[PDB]
C-alpha cells in the first residue's frame, strides 16, 4: 500500500502502490471444510468423502450436513446411530425393531429389519428413493429386500 | 493485552538514558523508546511536510 | 469407482483475461488520483508499469487455480499424493521394486497414477469392519494380478455371492490367485456370515466389434487408424472393473479421433444387458477403414 | 527463538536486524510460520513470529 | 499399521521462494517492454521503487497460497488448521487442566502439543469401531476389569453368535452383577440384527488337578531346579486361562524334562483333554512330592 513506499514518495507512486499490487483472495482453506464450501464446487468434495447417495434438491442446509457426516455414518455401518443419522434430510426418527417383539423366533430370513420413517414436510412422492437410499448401509446378506414405509 | 500508558515515564526513561551515553547536552527528541508497541490517536509526519 | 480427473477443469478464483484485468486496475487507480489525473500523467512509462501488472495477476488467477488442483484428488498429479493419502491411510507399496539385478541397469518402478487414486476414494469404505456393500470389494483390491469385485445376494440370508473377477487375458482366472481373496479376508468380515467364492459366476460369451470407419481426404491413414484403438483397447479393461454394461454409444464414441466424419457398426442387431452379476469377454477386434 | 512484534513493525526490518542480511531470510520467516503471510504485512501489535536458526 | 509421516517425500505444490527469482524477472519483463525507451537501473529510478512492490508483494500472496496449501494436509498443518481437520473427523483435543481459574492469577488451560494431534487424526482410521470379525467381538467385551482375555466362536452361521465370558475373580465363573455390564455395551457396539445370546458360560469350572512325582539327583542343585520347574508350571498355568486351553500329557513332559529331570509320573492327566471353544478350563492346584 501508500504505506509500504518509503516517506518520500510522490501522490503518484502513493497511488501505485494502491494498484500495483492488486492483492486477490486465496479461498484454499475453505474447499475442505463442508460447511463453508460455496455451492458451486461441492459435489468435489463429496466424491473424496465418499459420499454414496446424492440429490441436487436439498437445501443448502440439508447438503453441508451430509457431506460433515460422511465419516461417522461409514466409520459404524452395523450400529443403528449411523442408521438414525443416514436419514437426515428427511427428519425422522421414531421406532426401531428388535427381535423379542416377534415370538416365533424371528420371520424366515433370520430377521430382516422393517424401519419406521416418518415425514410430513413432503408428501408428494419420497417413497421410491427410501428402498434404495438404504441400501448402502444394509450389508450384502445380513437382511433381505423386505421393507415397510409409512408417510 | 495492549494497555494505555500515559507516555511520561518513558519520556524519563530517555532522559536518564541519553544522558548516560550521549550527555545531558544531547536531546533525547530523536531517541527510541524501546518497550511500546502503539500509540493512541497516532500522529502523521510523513517524510518533510 | 469412477475417475474424477477427466472433467473441465474447476476455477476455485475466477480466471479474467488481460484486457478487463488491466481496465480494472485503471479504474482504481482514477480513484486514487482523483483531481490529479492530467494527460501527461498517463505517460509510456506508466502505462508499460499498469501493463506488467495487468499481467502478473493474470499469473495469480492462474497461480491460485493450478495450486487447487494438486490439492483436490481431480488432477492431482505424481509425488503429492503422498501428502493426501497419508490423510486417508494410503501408503504406496513396492510392485517388483529396485533389485538390482545387473548394477547399471537400474529398474526402479512404483505404483502409477489413477489406481492409487482409486484406493484413496475407498479409503473411507475400509473403515467399516461389519462388512458393508463395498468392504468386500475396497479390500479385494490389495492384489494386483486381478480386476475389482462385485457383490450380490440371490440365496438365503448371511451367504455372501461375491464375483472375484481378474484381468491378466483370455477371461478364466486361476484358482491359486482365487485362494488369495480368504488370505485377504480373514479378519476382515463378520464372523457369522459366510461367502462362497465364484470367479465367473453367469458365463462368458464371445464378443467381436467390425467398424468402417472414414477418414477425411488429408493427413495419414496410419496413425488415426490406430489412434482409435488407443482409447479403446485401455476401455474394454475398464468395463467389468465396474461390472456395468457395453453399449452400442461405447462402440461408436471411442472410434471417434481427429479427422472423423461418419462412423458405422453392424456387430449387434440389437444391444445386449450386462447386470451386476452378468458379464462378457471380448476375444478379438478388426477396425480398419472403408475408403 | 520466539519474538513479539508490534503494531507497525515489518518483516524485512525485523529480520535484517536479527540475521544481519535478508538474502533467502525473509521468506524461509514466512515459511516457518503458520499464518504469518495470511495475516496483513503490517503487523499488529501482538503477534509472535518464530525466527528460525540457521538463515 | 500407520506409517510415519518423516519418512514421506517432500510435495509438488510447496516451494521454496525467492525474491532475487522474482525482482530480476521483473527486470526481464519491463527492460524489453520498453524496447530501450528506459535505461536507468540505478536504484534511486523510481522504476525500481515500484518493482519492489511488484516483487514483495506478489510474494506475499505467493506466501499465503503455500500457508493455504500446508493447512490442509496432515504432515505440515498446525495451529487452528488442524482443527478444521478435527472436526471432520471428529477428534477433538484433549483437556489436561480445565480452563477457569479459582484463584485471581488467571492458570492457564495446558493442551497437548500439535505434534501429538497428528498422532490423533493418523489413529481416527485404525481404531475399534465394531464388532465385526473375532478379534473385534473381544474388544468391545473390555468395558469391566476384573478379567482376562476371551475368544469368539458361531455355530450357525445366519442368527446366533456366542460370546464366553470368563473372568478370573476365584474359580473363573462369571458373576451375574457383570452379565448386564457386557450387555450395555454390545447393543449400541454391534450388528443390530444379531441373536446375541450372552449367558455366563457353555461350561464354566472344569477342574483340572495336576500332580507329579519327580524324580531326581539327590545332589546339591535338587533344591535349585526343583523350584525352576515349579515356577516354569506356574506362569503355563497362567497363560492356559484361555480358550485354547490345550491341557495335555505330553506337553507338560516337555515342560518338566527341559534341563535336569530324569523322569517323572503323572498322575492326574491320563488322557488328553477334548477340545471346544465353549468349555473352560481351571487348576486349583497340586500336590508335589520328591521321589527319593
Known sequence: SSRLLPPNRSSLERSLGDVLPAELPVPLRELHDPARCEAALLPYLAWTRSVDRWDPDWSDEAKRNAVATSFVLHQRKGTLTALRQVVEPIGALSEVTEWWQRSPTGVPGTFEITVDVSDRGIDEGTVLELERLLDDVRPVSRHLTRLDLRI | AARNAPASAYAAGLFAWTDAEYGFWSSPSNKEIKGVTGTSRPVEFLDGD | IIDLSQLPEPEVIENLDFETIYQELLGDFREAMAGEWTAEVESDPVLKLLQLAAYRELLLRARINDAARAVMLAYASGADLDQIGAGFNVQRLLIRPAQPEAVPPVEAQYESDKSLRNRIQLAFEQLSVAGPRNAYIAHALGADGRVADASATSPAPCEVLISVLGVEGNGQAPEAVLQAVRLALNAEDVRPVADRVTVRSAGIVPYQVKAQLYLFPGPEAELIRAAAEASLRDYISAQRRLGRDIRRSALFATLHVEGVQRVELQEPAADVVLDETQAAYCTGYAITLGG | ?55
Open chain 4, 1 to 55: 527463538t520466539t519474538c513479539r512484534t508490534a503494531d507497525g513493525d515489518m518483516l524485512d526490518s525485523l529480520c535484517y536486524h536479527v540475521y544481519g542480511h535478508l538474502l533467502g531470510c525473509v521468506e524461509a520467516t514466512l515459511d516457518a510460520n503458520p499464518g504469518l503471510a495470511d495475516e496483513q504485512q503490517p503487523f499488529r501489535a501482538g503477534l509472535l513470529i518464530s525466527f528460525p536458526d540457521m538463515p
